[PDB]
């Protein structure tokens, strides 16, 4: 059954509508998600 939510996965046009170390994961999803953009090299001056 597309256009409906078989389980929880309701399919819109392009978006998907689903539903439902602790503080470490919550902080890495709150602030430190794309904070590791300029953290790749760590002075790797190759």
């Amino acid at each position: 059954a597309p256009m409906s939510d078989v389980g929880g996965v309701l399919m819109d046009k392009d978006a998907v509508y689903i539903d439902i170390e602790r503080g470490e994961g919550e902080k890495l999803m709150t602030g430190l998600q794309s904070v590791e953009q300029s953290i790749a090299e760590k002075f790797d001056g190759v």
């Binding site: 996965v9 392009d14 978006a15 998907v16 790749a40 090299e41 760590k42 790797d44």
Partner: protein, 805 residues
């Protein structure tokens, strides 16, 4: 209900649009219940898709049981309790109770080498061997998702190492850290919470690609051109893959159908279905080919070839371990071992498997030689192909389950399957100055395995060195050379003082099979209830059973390898070994100099290897004592395993010399049962054992000569009469076979022998007849060498008679 992210569905969309695999790494506890959603997204991105799913785990499932009658009666008694209604299933229960899941342990990953899956669920992260990684991400196909679940210790390592360079704090493992950094580098991989949020540390930006295959259309065009008989039927049955594989099958068919002899050897990677092309060409060869064919695979390892043979036969016209017997209905084929079918090679066609080079030269002589060269040595086999046989050997490397994949690129980069044989030196004559210098530096393996770009390029050079034409090692051996406690390395590459650059002249991996350090590491690892890191000590601790070797620490060579240029490369390896003996005797940067002047308290230094001739010559330039071997035929090459161990320490010379003496005493008797190898190499081994005894002993293990009454009891008086009959008459077997055992024993005991007389003593020790051993070795003057052997026997009999009697 909540919209998830603009990137995680779009990644699956463009992954199935470009037919590329993709990697999800999920953290958190409630992570099993989001594989329903990712499998639904993977199917609805493109219905025309494989449905099966792997659940590789190591010891125990997460929250379920994988037995549907068991969980069915469990949910039946849950109904009978009444905490849950009848027609109710949460999506994880529905996912495991409706989908097609194949369950494997992490140990038996070799059981699923052939089949194909749409999804792979790696359950545990902390133990992930790279051979298992290479076996699962290869079988995941182009619309595929490989998901990896995590643990709180890995979350601590993630929060640590996601800042710049820090690690986790207690054998420490860096392969999983190199894994985390590679997934941070990958564009087709990202890390997701248990709540379907995003950690953008691994491939942050991802756009939805635009809505829409020329090599596939060229494949269809050339396939239809070949279509417009039974040759086209075989071509369409084979070409389930790239036009490279189709062109290879067509060219092998053209060069091996009616031309009866060519030597065609198709070389390819782990993909592309080389065995599939062989088994799909088998039916065409049975049609337009001889009545007998000869396969040379491993025994009971011909799954894809036999499956494609039966599949193509059923396509065209058909109907102690396993069954590999020959069948026909309107043909013969046998998957045999090494060439015991020399007189049974009436088959005009033989197809061999990938690399035993001398056994390959023995088997491939008088028929059409098809050969499958899997990459998974090759240069030397191509040289032996060009050194003899209209060789039309050609094949290509386009993938089968993809056209090209960043997941395959990251897997090859992390598991280090990529190689490069470029020079990149200062000079070869200036590397000969390094061969005069014998200068070596340590590896600093923590900073080496920390994935940085130039460090990874030099580490790929080091891996190409450490597995360059080696003795068939593997990715689990790379993980042992990375993440073991008893390990070190040495890169004696450059002598020059130029700018940033260099090479790898010789890698050499040590293994501290110790007493103190190994006892410390083993008492540590007994809390983790595992551990096996003492091979060279434990072989002699049962064979020779010495408390001295129980108390002395030891370094053991895991591997050591140099370039494949010339004999100067063996000179470079000898200089590296001599520099290592000098090194034993006399974040972080990815080298060491002061630690190259540092070591441990080690007594013995040994290398364990197979009994090879050049390895024996290297062991003699090494001159490390040729200690106790084992003549059990290790079925890879059939080579006997010898562990030559020097003692380079304060006071161990009497122990090592007595061990060499016991090995020498055992070898002359053990050359009768299961050591019938050579004459010159046997003399070299006896000379190496006596050289070890002479170098180690001063006058301690100095044996007395053959005593009078004991020598009278060892022979007979009439046996010595027959010896005199050989001295003044013929040396026939009525007096030269009953006494020859004691003759060869006393000759190898203790007053000199020639080269022909030494081969005669070794020939009587090997107990072969006259026309075999001397005619194989010298191949000249058979009866004259037999008379010289009789004269040496007469001189020995005259010496023993004039000594005792």
């Amino acid at each position: 209900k909540k919209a998830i992210d603009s990137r995680i569905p779009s990644l699956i969309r463009n992954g199935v649009q470009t037919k590329q695999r993709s990697i999800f790494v999920i953290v958190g506890d409630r992570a099993r219940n989001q594989l329903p959603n990712l499998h639904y997204l993977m199917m609805s991105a493109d219905l025309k898709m494989n449905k099966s799913v792997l659940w590789a785990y190591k010891k125990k499932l997460l929250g379920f049981t994988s037995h549907r009658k068991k969980r069915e009666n469990k949910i039946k008694k849950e109904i009978k309790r009444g905490t849950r209604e009848v027609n109710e299933m949460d999506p994880f229960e529905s996912f495991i109770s409706n989908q097609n899941i194949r369950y494997v342990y992490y140990k038996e990953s070799e059981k699923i080498l052939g089949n194909t899956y749409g999804m792979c669920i790696l359950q545990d992260f902390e133990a992930l061997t790279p051979n298992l990684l290479a076996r699962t991400i290869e079988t995941v196909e182009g619309g595929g998702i490989v998901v990896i679940l995590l643990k709180s210790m890995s979350s601590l390592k993630q929060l640590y190492t996601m800042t710049m360079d820090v690690h986790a704090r207690y054998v420490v493992a860096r392969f999983n850290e190199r894994f985390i950094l590679s997934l941070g580098s990958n564009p087709n991989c990202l890390v997701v919470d248990d709540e379907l949020n995003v950690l953008p540390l691994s491939g942050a930006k991802n756009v939805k690609p635009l809505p829409p295959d020329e090599l596939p259309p060229k494949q269809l065009e050339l396939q239809e051109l070949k279509e417009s008989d039974v040759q086209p039927a075989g071509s369409l049955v084979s070409l389930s893959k790239t036009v490279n594989q189709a062109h290879a099958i067509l060219s092998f068919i053209d060069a091996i159908s009616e031309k009866t002899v060519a030597l065609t050897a198709g070389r390819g990677r782990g993909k592309s279905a080389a065995l599939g092309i062989s088994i799909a060409a088998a039916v065409s060869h049975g049609y337009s080919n001889i009545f007998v064919t000869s396969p040379s695979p491993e025994n009971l390892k011909t799954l894809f070839e036999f499956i494609f043979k039966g599949f193509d036969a059923l396509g065209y016209q058909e109907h102690f371990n396993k069954a590999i017997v020959r069948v026909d209905i309107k043909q013969y084929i046998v998957p045999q071992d090494h060439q015991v079918l020399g007189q049974a090679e009436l088959v005009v066609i033989d197809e061999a498997a990938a690399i035993i080079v001398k056994n390959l030269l023995g088997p491939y002589l008088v028929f059409m030689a098809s050969t499958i060269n899997g990459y998974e040595l090759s240069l030397k086999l191509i040289q032996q192909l060009r050194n003899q046989q209209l060789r039309e050997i050609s094949l290509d490397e386009p993938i089968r389950y993809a056209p090209g994949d960043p997941i395959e690129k990251w897997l090859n980069k992390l598991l280090c399957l990529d190689v490069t044989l470029i020079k990149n030196p200062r000079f070869a004559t200036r590397g000969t100055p390094h061969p005069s210098q014998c200068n070596l530096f340590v590896v600093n393996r923590d900073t080496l395995f920390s994935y940085h770009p130039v460090s990874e390029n030099f580490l790929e050079k080091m891996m190409a060195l450490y597995v360059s034409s080696h003795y068939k090692n593997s990715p689990n051996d790379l993980q042992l050379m990375s993440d073991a406690p008893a390990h070190k390395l040495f890169v004696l590459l450059p002598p020059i003082d130029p700018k940033d650059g260099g090479r790898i002249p010789d890698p050499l991996c040590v293994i501290q099979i110790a007493l103190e350090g190994e006892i410390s590491k083993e008492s540590v690892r007994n809390s983790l209830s595992r551990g096996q890191r003492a091979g060279g000590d434990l072989i002699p601790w049962l064979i020779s059973q010495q408390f001295q070797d129980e108390e002395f620490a030891s370094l053991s060579g895991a591997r050591i390898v140099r370039i494949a240029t010339n004999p100067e490369y063996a000179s470079m390896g000898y200089g590296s070994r001599a520099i290592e003996l000098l090194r034993d005797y006399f974040l972080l940067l990815k080298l060491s100099e002061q630690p190259p002047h540092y070591l441990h308290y080690l007594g013995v230094s040994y290398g364990l290897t197979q009994s090879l001739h050049k390895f024996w010559k290297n062991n003699s330039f090494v001159p490390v004592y040729l200690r106790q071997t084992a003549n059990d035929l290790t079925g890879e090459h059939t080579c006997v395993m010898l562990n030559v161990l020097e003692g380079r320490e304060s006071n161990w010379l009497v122990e090592f010399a007595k061990d060499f003496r016991k090995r020498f005493l055992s070898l002359l008797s053990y050359d009768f049962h299961k050591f019938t190898a050579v004459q010159a190499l046997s003399v070299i081994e006896s000379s190496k054992k006596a050289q070890d005894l002479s170098d180690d002993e001063k006058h301690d293990n100095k044996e007395l000569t053959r005593t009078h009454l004991d020598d009278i009891f060892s022979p007979f008086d009439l046996k010595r009469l027959d010896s005199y009959s050989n001295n003044l008459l013929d040396y026939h077997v009525i007096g030269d076979m009953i006494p020859m055992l004691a003759l060869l024993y006393f000759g190898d005991k203790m007053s000199s022998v020639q080269s022909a007389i030494l081969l005669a003593i070794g020939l009587q020790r090997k107990n072969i007849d006259t026309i075999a051993k001397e005619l194989n070795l010298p191949s000249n003057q058979t009866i004259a060498m037999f008379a010289k052997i009789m004269r040496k026997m007469s001189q020995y009999f005259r010496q023993l008679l004039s000594q005792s009697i």
